[PDB]
Amino acid sequence: KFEVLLGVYTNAIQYVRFLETALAVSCVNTEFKDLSRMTDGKIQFRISV
Amino acid sequence: KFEVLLGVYTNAIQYVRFLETALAVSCVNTEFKDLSRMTDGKIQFRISV
């Protein structure tokens, strides 16, 4: 008279990146190895009217 | 002067197999020859959140 072990099932976490979803269209992305070295950034537009 | 016997036909009860109905899509089957020798069974799931 046995008690059968019918199944051990482990869900698989699928890996998801940033460039593999459709939120990546809204922004362009650049690898920047030393970001904590950078303290602040700036862009400067020259608008001639 | 007579009385007639106008045929005899009996109903043929069709054999309704499990694998010919739609309720076999709701489940999946395994032929276990010896379920009398089973006291209990279990499935343990591992959910990785």
Curated annotation (Swiss-Prot), chains A, B:
Coiled coil, from the record: none
Signal sequence range: none
Subcellular compartments: Virion; Host nucleus
Assigned protein family: Belongs to the herpesviridae major capsid protein family.
Known role: Self-assembles to form an icosahedral capsid with a T=16 symmetry, about 200 nm in diameter, and consisting of 150 hexons and 12 pentons (total of 162 capsomers). Hexons form the edges and faces of the capsid and are each composed of six MCP molecules. In contrast, one penton is found at each of the 12 vertices. Eleven of the pentons are MCP pentamers, while the last vertex is occupied by the portal complex.
Subunit details: Homomultimer. Makes the hexons and eleven out of twelve pentons. Interacts with triplex proteins 1/TRX1 and 2/TRX2; adjacent capsomers are linked together in groups of three by triplexes, heterotrimeric complexes composed of one molecule of TRX1 and two molecules of TRX2. Interacts with scaffold protein; this interaction allows efficient MCP transport to the host nucleus. Interacts with capsid vertex component 2/CVC2. Interacts with the small capsomere-interacting protein/SCP.
Protein name: Major capsid protein
Residue range from the parent sequence: 51 to 99 of 1381
